């Protein structure tokens, strides 16, 4: 009748989009990067070790100053770390002990956390009373908060278990724009340096591009075959990489609608839980589930450096904005800072 | 040493925070996480209300104090997600509490009864590698309703394995418990079970004994006694 015709038209449209993407694939990066010398092998040492958590942690986020950290654990405590002097700046009690994400504002005035409580609490670090208390409860989500990112002092994008993303306003306390279109459950978020647009990944192996101002999807990436729970923009902002559960990373291109290289090896079977980029973008860092962290070259797809740190799931890979340190937490309630 | 006054004061504040965190960890050493799982038709809400009476959206916790030890159950039934991305947060629980309705062996959409869905959920939750060191508690509510309902519906029409006392109101319950226990894999995990009604006084005492036995078995594994 009409539903079958619409479905077959959509399938044909997807097929012709794939054909157009294949048509413009003039040459990959393998045949054009043979003229440059590879980086080779690099070694990173654990310069700092932050051990003050009781339960397993799942989230971390660096600051603009590249010195303050925030980590969320299952003990119901949010504490601010010092990357230089190895001290706890704050200790925020949590009304809910089940949180899976945390966000640090670029200005450092506010910190947000979320998880199984379906409430994205906002804590005001710069409180006139000294103690850090909650400021606004971003309630109204039917799923578990998976990721949280700050793009402004009054705007925050939060993913949840309802297979959608929402843009919230702390002052009003209500969501502004809802990003619908994700068939799978979104798990990770990444904000572009221009802040105008952001990309998200879900359980349907699809990376959907979204715009903060527009509020509706513009670009769709389908290169993986398993659940995707890690994403990070390129420093240039024209590309991004996703970390899925089948031990693979693809450098998807915004202007090409296709992946560049596959960052995988036959010696890894576990999944990926967190991916991040360096300041230059030449070095790609991925957090695997093999009790180890691996480093991939964005232009040669080689395992240029292995980070033998913790002994449990990492889930807390991050890089400073100025590319000075690489903090790497894990379920063992430990934060290792690499350089 | 070389630290300044601001550095010394910040270090002192960090040490105070560490002391507070250590005290909180010591306090939390006397509380155990009990993952509560069940369908919406299993009477979870009235179950928690009855437990609260006997004692005296986002998830919710119910702390109870008995003999100076704290028990809390997390109600994750409101989560509609795939459950395969946040179930690892409950890896370090002591026991898993299951509530299965005794009057749902005939109620069904996809030509499947609720008992089949409960069995599938139990099978897919026991096999999870996260719950390898946690015991299982299988509560069975609406016991009185089963006695009256068994006179109308029969388990033979749905499960072709119930042979014997077809109309007894005492053998079908043992049979469903037995087949539920049969879902245990080769890894021998203790599955505690109780036959609770709408109004009872042993509802909290059974779970107290079950968590006590679970902690005893965990200590036996820790103490090299099996």
């Amino acid at each position: 009748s009409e539903l079958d015709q619409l479905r077959q038209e959509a399938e044909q449209l997807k097929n012709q989009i794939r054909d157009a993407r294949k048509a413009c694939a003039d040459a990959t990066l393998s045949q054009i990067t043979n003229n440059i010398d590879p980086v080779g092998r690099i070694q990173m040492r654990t310069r700092r070790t932050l051990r003050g958590h009781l339960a397993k942690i799942y989230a971390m986020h660096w600051g603009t100053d590249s010195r303050l950290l925030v980590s969320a654990s299952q003990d119901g405590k949010l504490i601010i770390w010092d990357s230089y002097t190895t001290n706890k700046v704050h200790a925020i009690p949590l009304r809910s002990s089940w949180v899976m994400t945390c966000a640090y504002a670029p200005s450092g005035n506010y910190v947000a956390c979320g998880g199984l409580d379906n409430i994205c609490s906002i804590y005001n670090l710069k409180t006139r009373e000294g103690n850090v208390r909650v400021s606004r409860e971003l309630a109204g989500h039917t799923g578990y908060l998976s990721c949280c990112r700050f793009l402004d002092d009054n705007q925050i994008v939060t993913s949840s278990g309802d297979t959608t993303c929402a843009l919230w306003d702390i002052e009003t306390g209500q969501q502004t724009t809802t990003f619908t279109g994700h068939t799978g459950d979104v798990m990770s978020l990444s904000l572009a340096p221009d802040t105008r647009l952001f990309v998200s990944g879900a359980c349907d192996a699809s990376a959907k591009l979204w715009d903060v101002r527009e509020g509706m999807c513009r670009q769709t990436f389908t290169g993986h075959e398993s659940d995707i729970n890690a994403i990070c923009f390129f420093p240039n902002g024209n590309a991004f990489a996703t970390g899925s559960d089948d031990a693979t990373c693809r450098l998807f291109d915004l202007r090409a609608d296709q992946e560049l290289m596959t960052y995988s090896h036959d010696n890894i079977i576990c999944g990926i839980t967190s991916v991040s980029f360096s300041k230059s973008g030449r070095l790609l860092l991925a957090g695997y589930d093999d009790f180890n962290c691996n480093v991939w070259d964005a232009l040669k797809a080689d395992r240029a450096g292995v980070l033998a740190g913790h002994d449990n799931r990492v889930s807390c890979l991050g890089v400073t904005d100025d590319g000075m340190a690489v903090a790497t937490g894990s379920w063992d309630s430990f934060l290792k800072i690499w350089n | 040493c070389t630290l300044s006054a601001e550095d010394k004061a910040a270090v002192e504040r960090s040490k105070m925070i560490d002391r507070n965190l250590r005290r909180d960890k010591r306090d939390a050493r006397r509380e155990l996480k009990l993952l509560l799982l069940g369908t919406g038709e299993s009477g979870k809400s009235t179950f928690i209300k009855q437990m609260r009476i006997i004692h005296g959206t986002g998830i919710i916790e119910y702390p109870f104090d008995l003999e100076n030890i704290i028990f809390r159950m997390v109600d994750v039934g409101g989560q509609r997600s795939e459950r395969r991305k946040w179930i690892h947060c409950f890896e370090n629980v002591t026991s898993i509490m299951f509530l299965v309705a005794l009057s749902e062996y005939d109620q069904v959409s996809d030509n499947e009864n609720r008992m089949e869905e409960s069995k599938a959920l139990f099978r897919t939750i026991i096999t999870y590698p996260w719950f390898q060191n946690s015991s299982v508690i299988l509560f069975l509510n609406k016991k009185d309703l089963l006695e009256d309902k068994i006179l109308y519906s029969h388990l033979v029409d749905y499960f072709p394995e119930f042979d014997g006392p077809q109309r007894d109101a005492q053998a079908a319950r043992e049979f469903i418990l037995k087949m539920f226990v049969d879902l245990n894999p080769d890894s021998d995990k203790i599955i505690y079970s109780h036959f609770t009604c709408a109004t009872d006084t042993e509802n909290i005492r059974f779970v107290f004994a079950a968590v006590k036995d679970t902690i005893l078995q965990l200590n036996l594994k820790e103490y090299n006694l099996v």
Epitope: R67, L68, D82, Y84, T85, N87, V89, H90, G108, R128, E129, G130, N131 | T2, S4, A5, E6, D7, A9, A10, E12, R13, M16
Partner: single-chain antibody
Framework: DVQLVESGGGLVQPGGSRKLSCSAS????????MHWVRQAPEKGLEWVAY????????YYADTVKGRFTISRDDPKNTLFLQMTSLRSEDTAMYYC??????????????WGQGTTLTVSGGSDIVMTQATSSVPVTPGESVSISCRSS???????????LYWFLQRPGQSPQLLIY???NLASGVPDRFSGSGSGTAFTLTISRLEAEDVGVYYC?????????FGAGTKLEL
Amino acid sequence: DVQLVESGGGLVQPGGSRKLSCSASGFAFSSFGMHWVRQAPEKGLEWVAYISSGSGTIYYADTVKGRFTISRDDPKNTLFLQMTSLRSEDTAMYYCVRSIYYYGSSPFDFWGQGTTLTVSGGSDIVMTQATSSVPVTPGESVSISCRSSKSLLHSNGNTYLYWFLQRPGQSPQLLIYRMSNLASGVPDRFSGSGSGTAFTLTISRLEAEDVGVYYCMQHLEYPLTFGAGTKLEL
């Protein structure tokens, strides 16, 4: 709001003992390092005693070392101050001052109202304030210079220089809490600068509210010493 009101004040014969207590409300008293600064009638502010959070670190100035003791009652939410023997040099108006220390924190946020009572210097850093009164016109540019015995630039990379302004008839407030950053509740017309020793404070578009007495504080060395006191008069 943060409120710090003092009590236990009044005239007393020299050689006696007086109990001074300030009530804390509107803020976390258990997480703030309380101080004690007195305003001498013929001088400026000067630190007396300090207590950390939870009575952890208790330090005293060399002038009032041993003679003055400080104790806080966290459950009672009240800071106490006991003095063994009083003298003419201790006749001043003490300030119950709160302070919290961490990365990016602003020490000496709120100053107590204070109470008045009457009777009837080694290895320290001194602030050299050559000027005492700077007559200026409203809306003009005002520059105030300060200096210390030794450079305040530590290995971390920032100098520990504090600026204060005491309005006539009320407690002072914090203006600058580091080398070149602004505190909370302070208009953005202030802009500190320097090169390690030549501390300066640039003020643009000065209003009639800036007639208070300025103060210069160092914090690289723990003993807190205020400046001479630059009283701006229109």
